[PDB]
Amino acid sequence: MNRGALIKLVESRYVRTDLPEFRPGDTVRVSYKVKEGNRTRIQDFEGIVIRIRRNGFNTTFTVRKVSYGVGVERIFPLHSPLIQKIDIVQRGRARRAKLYFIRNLSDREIRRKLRADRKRIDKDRAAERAAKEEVQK
RNA sequence: GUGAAUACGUUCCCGGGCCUUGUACACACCGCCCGUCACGCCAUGGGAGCGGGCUCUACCCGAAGUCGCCGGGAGCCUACGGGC
Numbered sequence: 001m002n003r004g005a006l007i008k009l010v011e012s013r014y015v016r017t018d019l020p021e022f023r024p025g026d027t028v029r030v031s032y033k034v035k036e037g038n039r040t041r042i043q044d045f046e047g048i049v050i051r052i053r054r055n056g057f058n059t060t061f062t063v064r065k066v067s068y069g070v071g072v073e074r075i076f077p078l079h080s081p082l083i084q085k086i087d088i089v090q091r092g093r094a095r096r097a098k099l100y101f102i103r104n105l106s107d108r109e110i111r112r113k114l115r116a117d118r119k120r121i122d123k124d125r126a127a128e129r130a131a132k133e134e135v136q137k
Numbered sequence: 138g139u140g141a142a143u144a145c146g147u148u149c150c151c152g153g154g155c156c157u158u159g160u161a162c163a164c165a166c167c168g169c170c171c172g173u174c175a176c177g178c179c180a181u182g183g184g185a186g187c188g189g190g191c192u193c194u195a196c197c198c199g200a201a202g203u204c205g206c207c208g209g210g211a212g213c214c215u216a217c218g219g220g221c
């Protein structure tokens with residue numbers, strides 16, 4: 001009874017963890033499986049993460065990509081069993097949670113609102129490489 | 138066979154001839170010619186609007202690119218002053 005919410009978690013065997021961390025205000029790419037008509041592809045889709053809707057298992061994130069002169073957005077679930085690889089590319093300062101203004105105001109004016117959150121860079125650059133020596137010995 | 142009147146004269150009506158005049162007339166005034174209207178054809182201006190081409194003013198976004206800066210709380214060659 002008093003486990004009412006543990007029940008769902010128990011139902012969460014479909015849980016992954018090789019996902020690297022990130023937070024709204026930075027760009028990233030995924031790699032996805034699409035029924036490519038006859039077969040299936042690894043559709044590398046790189047963009048900016050916009051929104052993050054957290055709810056334990058069914059936590060979703062929305063990625064936006066400007067392709068061929070068209071502002072697109074793409075919504076993915078975190079534990080989706082379709083993410084082969086997924087690797088960040090850059091990180092940036094937040095100042096706000098969501099950011100439904102990159103919709104309207106998409107240009108170079110976002111190359112100055114993003115800015116390089118170099119703090120987490122060193123953080124990423126730390127365990128990425130300096131901890132490799134903590135494997136090869 | 139017998140056997141008259143008057144023309145003073147050309148002002149005026151008619152015909153013809155000649156001179157001059159005019160013309161747009163010339164199978165020659167039964168001529169020539171004008172404009173509306175009616176019919177068909179032809180381009181055409183105006184004209185509620187329709188379709189394009191070109192140019193200009195202002196503002197927004199802005200690929201590749203040279204040039205000025207930072208090149209730093211990283212990447213990298215180090216030729217460790219530096220260069221990508």
Ligand SMILES: [Mg+2]
Binds near residue numbers: 181
């Ligand atoms: Mg006309």
